[PDB]
Amino acid sequence: LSTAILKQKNRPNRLIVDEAINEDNSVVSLSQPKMDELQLFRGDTVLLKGKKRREAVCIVLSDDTCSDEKIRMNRVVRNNLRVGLGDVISIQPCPDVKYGKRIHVLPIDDTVEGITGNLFEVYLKPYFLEAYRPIRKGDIFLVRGGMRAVEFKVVETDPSPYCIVAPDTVIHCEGEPIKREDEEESLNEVGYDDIGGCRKQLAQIKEMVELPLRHPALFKAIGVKPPRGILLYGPPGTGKTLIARAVANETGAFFFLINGPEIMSKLAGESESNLRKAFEEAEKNAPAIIFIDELDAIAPKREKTHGEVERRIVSQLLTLMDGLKQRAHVIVMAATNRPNSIDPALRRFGRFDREVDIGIPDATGRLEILQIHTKNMKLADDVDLEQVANETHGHVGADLAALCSEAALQAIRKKMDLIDLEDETIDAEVMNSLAVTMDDFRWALSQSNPS
Amino acid sequence: LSTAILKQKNRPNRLIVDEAINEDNSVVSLSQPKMDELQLFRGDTVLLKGKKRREAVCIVLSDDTCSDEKIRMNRVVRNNLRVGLGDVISIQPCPDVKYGKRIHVLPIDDTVEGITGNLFEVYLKPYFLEAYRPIRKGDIFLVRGGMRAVEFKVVETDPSPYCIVAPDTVIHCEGEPIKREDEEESLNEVGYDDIGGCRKQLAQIKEMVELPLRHPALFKAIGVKPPRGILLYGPPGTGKTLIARAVANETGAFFFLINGPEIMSKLAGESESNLRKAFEEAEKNAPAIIFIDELDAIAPKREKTHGEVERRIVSQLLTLMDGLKQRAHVIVMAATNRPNSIDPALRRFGRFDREVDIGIPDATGRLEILQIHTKNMKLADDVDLEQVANETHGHVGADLAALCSEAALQAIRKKMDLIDLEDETIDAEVMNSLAVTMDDFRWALSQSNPS
Numbered sequence: 001l002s003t004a005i006l007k008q009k010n011r012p013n014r015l016i017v018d019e020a021i022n023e024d025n026s027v028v029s030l031s032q033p034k035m036d037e038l039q040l041f042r043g044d045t046v047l048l049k050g051k052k053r054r055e056a057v058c059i060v061l062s063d064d065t066c067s068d069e070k071i072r073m074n075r076v077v078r079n080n081l082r083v084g085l086g087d088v089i090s091i092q093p094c095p096d097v098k099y100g101k102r103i104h105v106l107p108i109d110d111t112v113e114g115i116t117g118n119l120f121e122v123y124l125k126p127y128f129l130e131a132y133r134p135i136r137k138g139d140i141f142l143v144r145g146g147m148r149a150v151e152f153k154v155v156e157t158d159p160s161p162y163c164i165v166a167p168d169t170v171i172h173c174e175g176e177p178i179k180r181e182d183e184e185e186s187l188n189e190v191g192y193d194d195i196g197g198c199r200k201q202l203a204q205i206k207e208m209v210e211l212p213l214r215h216p217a218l219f220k221a222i223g224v225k226p227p228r229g230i231l232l233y234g235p236p237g238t239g240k241t242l243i244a245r246a247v248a249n250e251t252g253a254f255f256f257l258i259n260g261p262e263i264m265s266k267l268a269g270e271s272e273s274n275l276r277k278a279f280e281e282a283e284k285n286a287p288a289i290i291f292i293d294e295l296d297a298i299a300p301k302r303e304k305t306h307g308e309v310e311r312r313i314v315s316q317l318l319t320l321m322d323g324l325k326q327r328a329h330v331i332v333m334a335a336t337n338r339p340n341s342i343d344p345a346l347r348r349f350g351r352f353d354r355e356v357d358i359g360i361p362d363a364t365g366r367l368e369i370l371q372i373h374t375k376n377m378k379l380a381d382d383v384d385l386e387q388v389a390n391e392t393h394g395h396v397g398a399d400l401a402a403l404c405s406e407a408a409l410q411a412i413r414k415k416m417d418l419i420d421l422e423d424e425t426i427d428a429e430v431m432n433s434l435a436v437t438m439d440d441f442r443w444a445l446s447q448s449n450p451s
Numbered sequence: 452l453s454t455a456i457l458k459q460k461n462r463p464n465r466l467i468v469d470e471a472i473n474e475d476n477s478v479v480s481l482s483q484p485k486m487d488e489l490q491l492f493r494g495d496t497v498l499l500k501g502k503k504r505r506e507a508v509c510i511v512l513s514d515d516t517c518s519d520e521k522i523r524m525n526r527v528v529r530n531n532l533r534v535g536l537g538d539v540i541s542i543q544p545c546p547d548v549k550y551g552k553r554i555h556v557l558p559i560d561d562t563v564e565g566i567t568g569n570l571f572e573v574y575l576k577p578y579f580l581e582a583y584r585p586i587r588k589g590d591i592f593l594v595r596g597g598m599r600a601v602e603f604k605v606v607e608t609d610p611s612p613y614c615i616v617a618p619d620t621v622i623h624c625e626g627e628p629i630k631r632e633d634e635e636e637s638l639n640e641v642g643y644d645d646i647g648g649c650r651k652q653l654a655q656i657k658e659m660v661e662l663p664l665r666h667p668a669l670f671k672a673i674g675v676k677p678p679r680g681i682l683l684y685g686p687p688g689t690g691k692t693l694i695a696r697a698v699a700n701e702t703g704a705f706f707f708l709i710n711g712p713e714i715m716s717k718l719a720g721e722s723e724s725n726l727r728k729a730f731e732e733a734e735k736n737a738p739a740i741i742f743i744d745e746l747d748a749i750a751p752k753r754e755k756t757h758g759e760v761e762r763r764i765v766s767q768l769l770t771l772m773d774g775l776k777q778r779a780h781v782i783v784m785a786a787t788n789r790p791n792s793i794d795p796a797l798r799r800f801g802r803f804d805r806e807v808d809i810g811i812p813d814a815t816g817r818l819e820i821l822q823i824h825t826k827n828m829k830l831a832d833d834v835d836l837e838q839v840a841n842e843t844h845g846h847v848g849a850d851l852a853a854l855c856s857e858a859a860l861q862a863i864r865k866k867m868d869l870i871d872l873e874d875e876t877i878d879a880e881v882m883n884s885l886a887v888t889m890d891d892f893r894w895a896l897s898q899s900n901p902s
C-alpha cells in the first residue's frame with residue numbers, strides 16, 4: 001500500500017531472461033511479435049539494462065523457440081548485466097552508436113598462465129574481424145583460441161562508454177593481466193538484492209532519495225520542497241553500511257562517500273578541506289547523493305566535546321548543509337548507531353529532518369538474511385533455514401552473517417583429518433564434498449550471542 | 452573435537468628423528484622400504500622441515516639399522532631444524548638445487564679464540580673439497596681441524612636460499628666473528644612448544660589466522676569470507692605477548708609487530724605515519740599478520756580520552772582496518788588485558804569481530820607451564836611439579852615463571868657461604884652442584900601472590 005514504489009510494473013520492453021540458443025557474446029534473441037512491438041529491425045544494436053546499474057550492448061535477432069515476453073542471452077551477457085535466468089531486464093533501441101576509434105582490453109590473470117604467443121593474433125583478431133561487435137566499457141567476455149578459453153575485460157573505449165568494433169578500431173592489449181580477485185570483488189558489489197528484511201525502509205529511501213533526484217518535476221509540480229537530509233539509525237550491525245553500498249551501486253545519481261573516522265583521522269584543517277571538497281564535488285556532479293557514514297564520529301553534541309578542531313568540524317558541516325540552495329539537487333544521507341549523541345542542530349528542519357529506522361529484523365526478516373548469505377554456500381538437504389530463523393530471537397544481520405561463518409567453519413572441522421595445515425594445496429575430492437549440514441548450524445547456534 | 456586442527460596426522464613423509472650412525476653434517480639416513488615409498492634414490496638432495504619454520508638440506512642414504520618410519524641425523528642437523536630426538540619432521544624431494552656461485556661463512560666467536568692461521572685453509576677447504584655439500588642460509592655447522600672444532604654460520608648464498616657447494620663455489624669468510632649470544636638468543640626464540648595450558652586457544656588462532664592465509668581456497672570454495680580481526684584478551688600475564696612471539700616465529704605468513712606504547716611514544720603525526728607504514732608494508736608483503744600488542748594503549752574509548760592526537764589515532768586505525776579489501780590477505784591480531792576499555796567501534800563486524808580468551812590456566816595447564824619453564828633448570832629427584840601445580844590456585848603463567856625464579860634464588864642462597872660477591876669468578880664445583888630442590892619450591896610457594 002505504501003510499498004507501491006518498489007513494485008516492478010509490466011512494460012512492452014521489460015522481459016524475462018531465458019537461456020540462449022545462439023551462443024555469441026554479441027547476440028540477444030526475441031520473438032518476432034515482440035520485435036515489431038518495439039520497432040526493432042533485425043540486427044539492430046540494442047541497449048540492455050540489468051541489476052546494479054549494469055549494461056550490455058548487443059545486436060538483436062529473431063527467434064521462434066523464444067516466447068513473446070522472454071529474451072535469450074548466454075552466460076557472458078548475463079554476467080555483464082549481473083542477472084540470472086528468470087530476472088527482468090530493460091531493452092532499449094540504440095541507433096546512436098559510433099564506430100570505435102581505440103579500445104583497451106586485458107586478460108583475466110588465472111585464465112592466461114602459460115604461452116603468450118600473441119594474445120591479439122591468437123584470440124582477439126579472429127573474435128572481432130568483420131563482426132562489427134558492440135562492446136561496452138567494463139564488459140568481461142570469453143574467447144576460445146583452439147586450445148582453451150581466455151576471459152578479457154574492456155578497460156577503455158575512445159567513443160565515450162560504448163562503440164562498434166570495426167576494422168578501423170585499433171585494439172590495444174598493453175598492460176598487466178587484470179587480477180581475478182578484482183573482478184570477483186566487482187561481482188561481489190552490493191545491490192538491493194543483498195539486503196534482507198528491510199523492505200519498508202528501502203521503500204522510504206527510494207521515496208526520499210531516489211524519487212526527488214530522478215523526478216524533481218513531481219515535487220516541483222505538486223508544490224513541495226523535497227526533504228534534503230536523511231538519517232539512517234539503528235543498533236550495531238543492522239545493515240546501514242550495507243544499504244550505503246547498495247545505494248552507491250544501484251542509483252542513477254552520482255554518489256560520494258564520506259566515512260566519519262576517515263575524516264577525523266586527518267590533520268587539523270585538512271579534514272575541513274575534504275568535507276568542503278565532498279560538497280563542492282557533489283554540487284558539481286549531476287543530481288548527487290552524499291553519504292556520511294558513522295555521522296556520530298564527525299558530529300557529536302558541541303556541548304560535550306573537548307577539542308577545538310572537533311567543535312569546528314560540526315560548525316563546518318552545519319554551514320555546508322545550509323549552503324546547498326534548493327536548486328543544487330543534492331541529498332545528504334547519513335548513518336549512525338547512536339542517534340542520541342549527534343548535535344540536535346543537525347536534526348533540525350532543513351538538515352537531517354528525516355529518519356529511517358533500520359531496526360532489529362523479525363522472524364521473517366531473519367529468513368531473508370540467511371537466504372541472502374547462503375546463496376554461495378554449499379548446503380545440505382537437511383539444512384532448514386526457517387528453523388534457524390526461528391531459533392535466532394535477538395539476532396541482527398551481522399550476527400547472522402557470523403553464525404553462517406561459524407557453521408561453515410564447523411563443516412571444515414568435520415573434514416579436518418583429510419586436511420593438513422602444512423601441505424601446499426588441499427585435496428580436490430575434499431573440496432567438492434564440502435557441504436554445510438544442519439548439525440553444523442546447531443553447533444553455530446549453541447555458540448551464538450545477542451547485541 | 453574442536454581441537455582437530457592441532458592433530459599432527461600420519462603421512463608417508465612425516466618421520467620421527469633418531470640418532471645418526473653416519474656423523475656427517477650433510478647426511479640423513481632412511482630404511483630402504485621408506486626410500487622406495489617416497490621415490491628417493493641414493494644420494495639425492497632432500498629438504499627437511501623442522502619446528503619454527505626451520506629447514507635443512509641434506510643428502511639421503513640408505514640405512515639398515517634404521518626403522519621404516521624413522522630418520523637418522525646428527526646434532527648439527529637437529530640443531531638447524533630446532534628438533535630433539537623423538538620429534539617429527541617432513542622430508543621432501545629437492546632436485547631443484549643449483550650449484551653455488553658464492554657463499555659467505557663466519558665462525559662463532561667463543562669457538563675461535565687463539566690462532567687465525569687461516570680459517571678457509573685449515574677448516575673450510577678440507578670440509579667442502581669434492582664433497583658437493585648442500586647448505587642452507589642460516590645453517591650453523593661444526594668443523595674439526597686437527598686440534599679442535601669451530602662452529603660456522605652460513606650468512607649468505609648466491610643462489611637464493613640454498614645451493615650445492617661445488618669446486619666452482621667461491622668460499623668467503625670475511626667479516627667479524629658472529630656473536631655466541633646472538634645465536635643463543637636465536638635458539639631462545641619462542642614457538643608453540645613454549646606456550647602452556649592454551650590448547651583450545653591455539654586451535655582458535657590456527658583456525659582464524661593460519662588456515663585462511665595458508666588456504667584461502669577453502670573459505671572461498673565454501674562461500675565464506677574469512678574473519679579479519681582477532682583480539683586476544685585475558686588477565687595480566689596469561690601469555691598474550693608470548694603467543695604473539697610464538698606466532699611470529701611459527702607462521703608461513705609475513706609478520707608485523709606494532710607495540711601500543713611504542714606507537715604512543717612518538718611525535719604527533721609521526722605515530723600515524725608508522726601505523727600507515729605498518730599496513731602498507733603488510734599489504735605489500737604476501738599473506739600477512741599484523742599484531743597490535745597492548746591495543747588499549749592506542750585505541751581507548753574516544754568518548755573518554757583527553758588529547759586530540761589520541762582521538763586522531765583511533766580514527767587512523769579504524770580507517771586502515773576498513774581500508775583492507777577482502778583480497779589483501781591480511782589478518783590483524785591484537786592483545787589486551789582491559790578489553791572493556793577499547794572503543795566499541797573497533798570491536799564491530801569487520802574489525803575485531805573475533806575474540807580469543809586467554810584466561811587463567813587450570814591445574815593441568817599449570818603443570819604444562821611448569822614443565823616448559825623448568826626445561827633448562829637443574830632439578831632434584833624430590834621436585835614434584837604436579838604438587839606445585841596443585842598448590843598454585845590463582846596463578847597465571849607470569850606468576851609461575853616468577854615462582855620458578857624465586858625457587859632458584861633460594862637454591863643460590865643455600866649455596867651462599869661457598870660464594871662471595873667480591874671474587875671475579877664463582878668456583879667450578881659450586882656451579883655444578885646447583886640443583887633446585889623441592890624445599891626451595893615450598894619456600895617460593897610460601898612467598899607467592901595472586902593476579
Ligand SMILES: Nc1ncnc2c1ncn2[C@@H]1O[C@H](COP(=O)(O)OP(=O)(O)OP(O)(O)=S)[C@@H](O)[C@H]1O
Nearest residue numbers: 195196236237238239240241242337397398401800
Ligand atoms: N539487513 C541485512 N541484510 C543482509 N545482510 C546484513 C543485514 N544486516 C547486516 N548484514 C550483514 O552484516 C554485515 C555488517 O553489517 P553492516 O552493514 O556493517 O551493519 P551496520 O548497520 O553498518 O553497523 P554499524 O552501525 O556500522 S556498527 C554486512 O556486511 C552484511 O553481510
Ligand SMILES: Nc1ncnc2c1ncn2[C@@H]1O[C@H](COP(=O)(O)OP(=O)(O)OP(O)(O)=S)[C@@H](O)[C@H]1O
Nearest residue numbers: 645646647687688689690691692693788848849852
Ligand atoms: N601460558 C603460558 N605458558 C608459558 N609461559 C607463560 C604463559 N603465560 C605467561 N608465561 C610466562 O610469563 C611471561 C609473561 O607473559 P606475557 O606473555 O607477557 O603475558 P601477557 O598475557 O602478554 O600479559 P599482559 O596482558 O601483557 S600484562 C612470559 O614470557 C612467559 O615466560
Ligand SMILES: [Mg+2]
Nearest residue numbers: 237240241242
Ligand atoms: Mg556500519
